[PDB]
Write a protein that binds this ligand. Structure first.
Ligand SMILES: CCCCCCCC/C=C/CCCCCCCC(=O)O[C@@H](COC(=O)CCCCCCCCCCCCCCC)COP(=O)([O-])OCC[N+](C)(C)C
Ligand SMILES: CCCCCCCC/C=C/CCCCCCCC(=O)O[C@@H](COC(=O)CCCCCCCCCCCCCCC)COP(=O)([O-])OCC[N+](C)(C)C
Ligand SMILES: *[C@@H]1O[C@H](CO)[C@@H](O[C@@H]2O[C@H](CO)[C@@H](O)[C@H](O)[C@H]2NC(C)=O)[C@H](O)[C@H]1NC(C)=O
Ligand SMILES: CC(C)CCC[C@@H](C)[C@H]1CC[C@H]2[C@@H]3CC=C4C[C@@H](O)CC[C@]4(C)[C@H]3CC[C@]12C
Ligand SMILES: CC(C)CCC[C@@H](C)[C@H]1CC[C@H]2[C@@H]3CC=C4C[C@@H](O)CC[C@]4(C)[C@H]3CC[C@]12C
Ligand SMILES: O=S1(=O)NCN(C2CC2)c2ccc(F)cc21
Lengths: 48, 48
């Protein structure tokens, strides 16, 4: 061989995992979708 | 409902407690008006 014109290295080629976006109704996520009903049935209940 | 959970229990506790003290104040104003007219049914029914 001659003396190298480019430096190498064995590495791993693999797909990027998809960065699924936090869609614009993201702030409802910190409570479960039945708890949002249970708060709604509370403030419809306790008010009654 | 597994995570928070117990605030709905104490919401169910205080309101049932509040209906108890609501009758106790109703029977108390039947009691201070009991020295006016009759024993209960005067100040009960007029305030019922
Ligand atoms: C904190 C104090 C209490 C406040 C009172 C609240 C009590 C009354 C509330 C009652 C219920 C409120 C919403 C809860 C249920 C929907 C949310 C949900 O489940 O997520 C769903 C998504 O969401 C959506 O994509 C569409 C559904 C949301 C519609 C907008 C609701 C209006 C909020 C206004 C509320 C009233 C405002 C005025 C209030 C006077 C589930 O979908 P996912 O598959 O899990 O995720 C999608 C994935 N992605 C995003 C990547 C695509
Ligand atoms: C006294 C006691 C009560 C008596 C009993 C009475 C009976 C009541 C019993 C009720 C039983 C419960 C049944 C509902 C279950 C829903 C959960 C769910 O998974 O579905 C979805 C709820 O996401 C929504 O779309 C919610 C609807 C919009 C939110 C706005 C509502 C409040 C508005 C403001 C309130 C003003 C407050 C004013 C206060 C003065 C979440 O999943 P998803 O992925 O989003 O699905 C999309 C569905 N879609 C395609 C059709 C959109
Ligand atoms: C990013 O890569 C692909 C592109 O959508 C997703 O892989 C899919 O996964 C579903 C089930 O989860 C299957 O249909 C296949 O395995 C894939 N679909 C296709 C069309 O190949 C992957 O879920 C995405 N998201 C990540 C990695 O978060
Ligand atoms: C005042 C009223 C209108 C509020 C809403 C209704 C309440 C009483 C109901 C609706 C759903 C109910 C919950 C449903 C499921 C469970 C899980 C169980 O392992 C313990 C009880 C518990 C945690 C219940 C507690 C009471 C509850 C929160
Ligand atoms: C615990 C229950 C069962 C019995 C006690 C009820 C209490 C909360 C009730 C009974 C008598 C009530 C009082 C009766 C009269 C007055 C005078 C008024 O100008 C202000 C309110 C005030 C001061 C009331 C406050 C509430 C009161 C103290
Ligand atoms: O000075 S060299 O012998 N010949 C030139 N090259 C490079 C192309 C970068 C490199 C690259 C890495 C080396 F270790 C040596 C050399």
């Amino acid at each position: 061989f001659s003396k190298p014109f480019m430096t190498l290295g064995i590495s791993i080629l693999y797909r990027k995992p998809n960065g699924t976006n936090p869609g614009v109704f993201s702030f409802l996520n910190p409570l479960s979708p039945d708890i949002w009903m249970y708060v709604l049935l509370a403030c419809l209940g306790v008010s009654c | 409902v597994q995570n928070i959970g117990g605030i709905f229990i104490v919401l169910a506790a205080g309101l049932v407690l509040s209906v108890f003290v609501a009758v106790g104040e109703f029977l108390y104003k039947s009691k201070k008006n009991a020295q006016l007219e009759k024993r209960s049914f005067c100040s009960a029914m007029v305030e019922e």
